[model samples]
Target: VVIPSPCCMFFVSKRIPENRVVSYQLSSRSTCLKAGVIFTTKKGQQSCGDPKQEWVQRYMKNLDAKQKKASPR
Candidate 1:
């Protein structure tokens, strides 16, 4: 089995509070140089929530959206 780790897991360089795809960096192995290793490897290469992709986007967005609405922030 493969766990497939997505990027959007952190900020363009780290992580945000809202945890939204609005602004974030994907992973190299997570993205497509593995997409972005030269400039933003640590920060990431793509947003795990990029609509273009479903391996991570759909799950994260849905999960976060639900929690956001139910929670205060």
Candidate 2:
């Protein structure tokens, strides 16, 4: 599954036949060619909360912090 948000883009799918995997691919395509963090799930229980949402929140937080740090008068 691919979820596109205003702040980030993510992909979620199952792996290892029985294991669930979630991946977040962040891109700064607007400002730079830098690719940010890529988060993934480890092997184990797959009944946790939505990893996509988790990563989006985390990405937004990081983006906000970066903006604040780079802001100037």
Candidate 3:
């Protein structure tokens, strides 16, 4: 699903083949940036968050830039 902006958000996701894992591009729009501020969803629920928000935080910790995330639509 490509849930682009209508409310200033951008999402590009698809389930990985043979796996329940999802591949996504969750972002917010700014009309003046590369990818928007937060990057999106911010853990709305179990069915939300690009790869799962908790997982995202952990992944971020791994990347040295983690600490919860984005939204805008």
Candidate 4:
């Protein structure tokens, strides 16, 4: 998933392996210009910075039997 904000964009990806758990990672890249007076000045303050920030909280989750079976070998 990709979440875009006025100053930056967040990139998230997940991967799961057979007989193993699922893993997730998130990274952010900024495109904000220092001279952009209209943009927010506070660090980590953005339209998508609040609840969407939770997307990076976890690195892994257990997969159910169905998901495990459906996953690639």
Give the per-residue lDDT digits (tens) of candidate 4, residues 14-38: 3212223232222234444321111
Question: Candidate 3 or 4, higher TM-score?
Answer: 3
Residue 31, model 4, lDDT: 46
Worst 10 residues of 3 by lDDT: 14-23
Worst lDDT 10-window in candidate 2: 10-19
Which scores better on lDDT, 1 or 3?
A: 1
Candidate 4 has its poorest 10 consecutive residues by lDDT at 33-42
As a TM-score, model 1 comes out at 0.22
Kindly give the stretch of ten consecutive residues in candidate 1 with the minimal lDDT sum: 33-42
Inter-residue clash pairs, candidate 1: 8-48, 11-14, 11-15, 26-45, 26-46, 32-35
Kindly report which residue stretches of model 2 are placed more than 4 angstroms away from their true locations once superposed.
1-11, 14-52, 71-73
Q: For candidate 4, give the lDDT of residue 17.
A: 26
**Residue pairs in collision within model 2:** none
Please give me the total number of clashing residue pairs in predicted model 4.
Answer: 0
Q: Write the per-residue lDDT of candidate 2 for residues 3-58, one digit (tens) a residue.
A: 34323333333212212334343444464323343444455332222334554465
Off by over 4 Å in 3: 1-26, 30-52, 65-73
| Model 1, runs deviating above 4 Å | 1-33, 36-52, 71-73
